[PDB]
C-alpha cells in the first residue's frame, strides 16, 4: 500500500509537471509572437521566460505541499477530536471552608439505599443496600466474582455512576465534595498492581513530603524492609517500567507500602492479598490490624480465613447485602453464604 501510494503520487506529479511544461511552451510561443510583430522590448519577454520557468519549477511543490498539508492537518483533526471530550466535573457543590481541616477524624460511614451503575445505559450492578459503620468497626466484604465487590470499593470515591443514595461519611455529603479533597484523604489499594518507573522514594511519595522514618516504618509494617535493605541501593534504587524489576507479590507489597504512607481514617482495600502467600499474608494482617487500631479498615476478602477475625462481615451476592452480621453468628447459622464460603475453603 505504500508503493501504490508512491506510484499514484508520482503519477500526479508527472501530469502536473507535464502541464507546467505546456505552460512553458504556450507562454514562450506567445511571448515571442507577442514581440516579433509588435514591440515589447525583450526585458518583459525574458521576465516572462524566467517566471514561466518558476511556474514549471514550483507547481509540483505547491500540489505536493498542499496534499502533505492535508495529511498533516489530519493530526490536528485527531487532536481536536480528542480535545473536546468529557470532563469529570471536579468541583463539588459545597464550599471548601465548610469541610474541616481535620475532615477524616472518625469514620461514621452511613450507607442508605445505594444502587450504582457504570454509565446511563447499563444494568445496575448493585442492588439497594444499606449499612451503618462505626469508627472502630473493621468490616470486611465477601462474595463471588462479579457480584459488586470491587465496585463497592470504587463507589466511595464517586468512580462509578452512583445515580442515587446516602453514602455520607461524618455528616458531610460525599456528592457535595471537591474531588481532590475526597480522593486525597481516603486511600484505596487495587488488586492489579500498578507501579511507576523511577525510584522507591518517589514511588511511595511523589511529593517528597513525608519523612524517611515514615517510609522505613511503612516498609516495616508491610514486611518489605529486609527485602529493600538487602538490595544494593538500600533506598532510592531503581524500579523499572511496570515494576518488572521485582516480583508480582513485591509489586502488590509496594502497593501496600504506598497505601501506608498516607495515614488514613478510611483505609479501604480491594483483594490485595491475591498474589501474596498465606504465610506473609497472615503475618501482614496481624500487623496492620494492630498497628491501625483507630482507623477504620475495610477489606475485600480473597481468603476468608483472613476475613474471619473482623468486626462484622458483609456478604455481597449479586449486588445486594445478603448478610450483615457477626462472623460467629453467620458461622453458627450453618446455612449461610459466609459459612458455605468458609466451608468450601477449609
Amino acid at each position: 500500500a505504500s508503493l501504490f501510494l508512491t506510484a499514484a503520487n508520482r503519477w500526479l506529479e508527472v501530469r502536473m509537471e507535464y502541464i507546467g511544461a505546456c505552460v512553458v511552451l504556450i507562454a514562450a510561443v506567445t511571448s515571442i509572437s507577442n514581440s516579433l510583430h509588435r514591440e515589447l522590448s525583450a526585458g518583459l519577454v525574458g521576465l516572462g521566460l524566467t517566471y514561466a520557468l518558476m511556474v514549471s519549477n514550483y507547481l509540483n511543490w505547491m500540489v505536493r505541499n498542499l496534499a502533505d498539508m492535508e495529511l498533516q492537518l489530519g493530526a490536528v483533526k485527531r487532536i481536536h477530536g480528542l480535545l473536546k471530550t468529557e470532563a469529570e466535573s471536579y468541583e463539588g457543590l459545597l464550599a471548601p471552608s465548610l469541610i474541616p481541616k481535620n475532615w477524616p477524624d472518625q469514620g461514621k460511614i452511613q450507607i442508605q439505599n445505594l444502587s450504582v451503575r457504570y454509565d446511563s445505559s447499563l444494568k445496575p450492578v448493585l442492588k439497594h443496600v444499606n449499612a451503618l459503620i462505626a469508627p472502630g468497626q473493621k468490616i470486611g466484604i465477601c462474595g463471588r466474582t462479579g457480584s459488586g465487590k470491587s465496585s463497592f470499593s470504587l463507589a466511595f470515591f464517586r468512580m462509578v455512576d452512583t445515580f442515587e443514595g446516602h453514602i455520607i461519611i461524618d455528616g458531610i455529603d460525599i456528592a457535595k465534595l471537591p474531588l481532590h479533597t475526597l480522593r486525597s484523604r481516603l486511600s484505596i489499594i487495587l488488586q492489579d498492581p500498578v507501579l511507576f518507573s523511577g525510584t522507591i522514594r518517589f514511588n511511595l511519595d511523589p511529593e517528597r513530603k513525608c519523612s524517611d522514618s515514615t517510609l522505613w516504618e511503612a516498609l516495616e509494617i508491610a514486611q518489605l524492609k529486609l527485602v529493600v535493605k538487602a538490595l544494593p541501593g538500600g533506598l532510592d534504587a531503581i524500579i523499572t517500567e511496570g515494576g518488572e524489576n521485582f516480583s508480582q507479590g513485591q509489586r502488590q507489597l509496594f502497593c501496600l507500602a504506598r497505601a501506608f504512607v498516607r495515614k488514613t481514617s478510611i483505609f479501604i482495600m480491594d483483594e490485595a492479598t491475591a498474589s501474596i502467600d498465606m504465610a506473609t499474608e497472615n503475618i501482614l494482617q496481624k500487623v496492620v490490624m494492630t498497628a491501625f487500631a483507630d482507623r477504620t479498615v475495610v477489606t475485600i476478602a480473597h481468603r476468608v480465613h483472613t476475613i474471619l477475625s473482623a468486626d462484622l462481615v458483609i456478604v455481597l451476592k449479586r449486588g445486594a447485602i445478603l448478610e450483615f452480621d457477626k462472623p460467629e453468628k453467620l458461622l453458627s447459622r450453618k446455612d449461610s453464604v459466609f459459612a458455605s464460603f468458609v466451608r468450601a475453603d477449609k
Binding site: 505504500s2 508503493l3 508512491t6 506510484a7 508520482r10 506529479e13 508527472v14 509537471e17 507535464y18 511544461a21 512553458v24 511552451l25 514562450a28 510561443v29 515571442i32 514581440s35 516579433l36 525583450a42 526585458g43 525574458g46 521566460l49 524566467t50 520557468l53 514549471s56 519549477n57 463471588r144 466474582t145 462479579g146 470515591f157 468512580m159 474531588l179 481532590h180 480522593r183 486511600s187 484505596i188 487495587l190 488488586q191 492489579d192 500498578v194 518507573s197 511523589p206 511529593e207 523499572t240 517500567e241 518488572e244 524489576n245 508480582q248 507479590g249 507489597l253 504506598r258 491475591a274 498474589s275 501474596i276 502467600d277 498465606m278 504465610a279 506473609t280 497472615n282 475453603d345 477449609k346
Partner: protein, 593 residues
C-alpha cells in the same frame, strides 16, 4: 484485496537476505557499509537519473541567452548551425523538449529512491524482528530499554532512516548542481561572475556550523521526547491509580517539566533552522546583488544585455531551487545518524545462548550479568505426566524456576536435560493477543471444536462469554474492549489447557479468581483434562489447600529449594514446614494426605 501482492524483487526475505548477506562481508559503520553494499546499486541508478536530470534543466538559461539575444537583433537551401540556434521558435520548442525529459527523469529519480527506502523499511523491520525474537528478557526488565522504546524505534527511527533514503540522491547532486552552474555562469559573464561569490563558496563553514548546532539540538530533542513518551506511557497506563490517589497534578507537573525541557531544545532548533533558511534564501539574492552591481561597477562593461541578465537571473534561480531543500536535508541526515546509532545500540544487546522430563541439576540461575545468583544451588526431579506444585513465600524463585527451564535466565553453572520442546505456559501477568476471543484461545492450533467447547466448560468461560456483545468474536485487548482481569487470567490459562504441548507450566491462576471458580478450575480442567491424558502440569500457586492434590511438592525459600518429593516425603523428613502448613491451612485435626 485486488491491489494484489508485490513482486519477488521487493519481498521481505528477498531483501533482508541481501542485508544479512551484506553482514558477512567481513558498530554503526558496519551497518552503513552493509547498506552501501546492499542498496547502493539502485541508489546510483537514482543518482544517475538525478544527474541526467538538471543538466537538461540547464537549457532554461541557455535558451534565454539564445532568444533574447536573437530578439534584440546549396547556398540558397541549407541552414547552418549558428543560424539554426539563433531563432526563437526552434529554441522554444527545444525548451519544451528539454523540460519534458528532465521532469520525467526527476520523477523517475524520486521513484527509485522511495522504492529503495521501502525495501530498506522491509529489510530493517525483518532484521528488527529477528533481533527481538532472540532478545533476553533482562534487557526489558533489568534497566536498559523499554517496550515503548522498542516499538517506538520501528515507528519513528525506521521511518527516519527511510525518510533519509527518500532524499539520499539529492545530496549527491549537490556537488554537480553548483559546479556546472558555476561553469555555465563563467561562460556567460566571465570574470564578473565569480564576484557573485556568496554562492560559489556558500560559506559552507557556516552551513556545517548550523548543521552541528542542529545536531546539538537534535540529540537532546530525541532524548527528551523519549523521556516524555516514557512518562506519558506510565501515566496513561496508571491513570486509574493516579486519579484515585489524586496524584494527577504531581505527575502532570513532572510531564510538564519534561515538556518544557524538550521545548527549550525546540526553541534552539527552530531558531537555528530559521537562521539556516534565512542564510539559504538570502545568499542568492545577495549573489545577484554583488554580481549585478559588480558587473556595472568595478568591472568595465562587456555587453550587459537583457539576454545575459535574464540568463544569469534564471541561472541563479535554477542554482537556488534545489538549495531551498537543504535545511530539511540536514535535519533528515542528522535524524538518520541518531537513528542508526540507536539502531546499532539495539542489535548489539544481550541475547539467549525414565520417569522424568526436566533435569535441572546444580544450576545457578541469575537475572543479572553482574549480580549475585538469584536462583541458588537447586536440583529438580520433576516427573512426567503428574501434577507438581511449587510453593513458597514472596520472592523465593517461584517464577524464576519456571523461567529457568525455558532458558530465559543466565545459566552460570549446572545443566538442564529436557524431555527443548513446546511448553504450555500461562504467565503471572496474563497476556492478550489483540484479536477475537476464540483466536486468543486457539493461538494458531487446529480448531478442535469439541476440545474448544470442552475447555470453555472446563474453566467456566460460558457465563462470561454470554455477556460479551459478540461472544467469541469480540475484539479484546489493548485495541478494542477492556476486560476485568478475572476473565483475563482465566482467558490466559484457558489457552494453556489447550495447545497439545504436553508440558504445562501453569503459573499462578488463582490470584484474580475466587474460591468457587478456583475449585472449578481445580476439579475440571486441572485433574480432569490435564491428567486425562498424560500431561505434565507444573502448577505453582499460593493456594495451599490444593497440596492434597499433588504428586510432587517443591518447597521454595530465598532462592534455593528445601526439598523435592511427595507429601508423605514432606511428612517424613522435614516436619517443620509440614507443621507450618498444618497451621496455615487451619487443618490441625485432619491430615494432609
Amino acid at each position: 484485496r485486488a491491489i494484489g501482492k508485490l513482486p519477488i524483487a521487493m519481498r521481505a526475505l528477498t531483501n533482508y537476505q541481501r542485508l544479512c548477506e551484506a553482514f558477512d562481508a567481513q558498530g554503526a559503520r558496519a551497518i552503513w557499509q552493509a547498506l552501501s553494499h546492499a542498496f547502493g546499486r539502485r541508489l546510483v541508478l537514482s543518482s544517475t537519473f538525478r544527474i541526467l536530470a538538471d543538466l537538461l534543466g540547464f537549457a532554461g538559461p541557455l535558451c534565454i541567452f539564445g532568444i533574447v539575444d536573437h530578439l534584440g537583433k546549396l547556398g540558397v537551401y541549407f541552414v547552418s548551425s549558428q543560424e539554426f540556434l539563433a531563432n526563437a521558435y526552434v529554441l522554444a520548442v527545444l525548451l519544451f523538449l528539454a523540460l519534458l525529459l528532465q521532469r520525467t527523469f526527476l520523477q523517475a529519480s524520486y521513484y527509485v529512491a522511495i522504492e529503495t527506502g521501502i525495501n530498506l523499511r522491509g529489510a530493517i523491520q525483518t532484521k528488527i524482528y529477528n533481533k527481538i525474537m532472540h532478545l533476553s528478557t533482562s534487557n526489558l526488565s533489568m534497566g536498559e530499554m523499554t517496550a515503548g522504546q522498542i516499538c517506538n524505534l520501528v515507528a519513528i527511527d525506521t521511518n527516519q532512516l527511510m525518510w533519509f533514503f527518500f532524499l539520499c540522491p539529492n545530496l549527491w547532486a549537490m556537488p554537480v548542481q553548483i559546479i556546472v552552474g558555476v561553469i555555465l555562469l563563467y561562460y556567460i559573464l566571465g570574470v564578473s561572475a565569480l564576484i557573485g561569490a556568496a554562492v560559489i563558496i556558500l560559506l559552507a563553514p557556516v552551513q556545517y556550523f548550523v548543521a552541528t548546532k542542529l545536531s546539538q539540538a537534535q540529540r537532546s530533542t530525541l532524548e527528551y521526547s523519549n523521556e516524555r513518551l516514557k512518562q506519558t506511557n506510565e501515566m496513561l497506563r496508571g491513570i486509574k491509580l493516579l486519579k484515585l490517589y489524586a496524584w494527577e497534578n504531581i505527575f502532570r507537573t513532572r510531564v510538564e517539566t519534561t515538556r518544557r525541557k524538550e521545548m527549550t531544545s525546540l526553541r534552539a532548533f527552530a531558531i537555528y533552522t530559521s537562521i539556516s533558511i534565512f542564510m539559504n534564501t538570502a545568499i542568492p539574492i545577495a549573489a545577484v546583488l554583488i554580481t549585478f552591481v559588480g558587473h556595472v561597477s568595478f568591472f568595465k562593461e562587456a555587453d550587459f544585455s537583457p539576454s545575459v541578465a535574464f540568463a544569469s537571473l534564471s541561472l541563479f534561480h535554477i542554482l537556488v531551487t534545489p538549495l531551498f531543500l537543504l535545511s530539511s536535508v540536514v535535519r533528515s541526515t542528522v535524524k538518520a545518524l541518531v537513528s542508526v546509532q540507536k539502531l546499532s545500540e539495539f542489535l548489539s544487546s544481550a541475547e539467549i545462548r525414565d520417569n522424568c522430563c526436566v533435569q535441572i541439576m546444580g544450576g545457578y540461575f541469575t537475572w543479572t550479568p553482574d549480580g549475585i545468583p538469584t536462583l541458588s544451588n537447586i536440583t529438580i526431579r520433576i516427573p512426567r505426566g503428574q501434577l507438581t506444585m511449587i510453593v513458597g513465600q514472596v520472592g523465593c524463585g517461584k517464577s524464576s524456576l519456571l523461567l529457568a527451564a525455558l532458558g530465559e535466565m543466565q545459566k552460570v553453572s549446572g545443566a538442564v536435560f529436557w524431555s527443548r520442546g513446546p511448553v504450555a505456559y500461562a504467565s503471572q501477568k496474563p497476556w492478550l493477543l489483540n484479536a477475537t476471543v476464540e483466536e486468543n484461545i486457539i493461538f494458531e492450533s487446529p480448531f478442535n471444536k469439541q476440545r474448544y467447547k470442552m475447555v470453555i466448560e472446563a474453566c467456566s468461560l460460558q457465563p462470561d462469554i454470554d455477556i460479551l456483545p459478540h461472544g467469541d468474536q469480540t475484539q479484546i485487548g489493548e485495541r478494542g474492549i477492556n476486560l476485568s482481569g478475572g476473565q483475563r487470567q482465566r482467558i490466559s490459562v484457558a489457552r494453556a489447557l489447550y495447545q497439545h504441548a504436553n508440558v504445562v507450566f501453569l503459573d499462578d491462576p488463582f490470584s484474580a479468581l475466587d474460591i468457587h471458580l478456583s475449585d472449578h478450575l481445580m476439579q475440571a480442567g486441572i485433574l480432569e483434562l490435564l491428567r486425562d491424558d498424560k500431561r505434565t502440569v507444573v502448577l505453582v500457586t499460593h493456594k495451599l489447600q490444593y497440596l492434597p492434590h499433588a504428586d510432587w511438592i517443591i518447597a521454595m525459600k530465598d532462592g534455593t529449594i528445601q526439598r523435592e518429593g511427595t507429601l508423605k516425603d514432606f511428612q517424613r523428613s522435614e516436619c517443620q514446614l509440614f507443621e507450618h502448613w498444618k497451621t496455615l491451612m487451619n487443618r490441625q485435626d485432619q491430615e494432609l494426605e
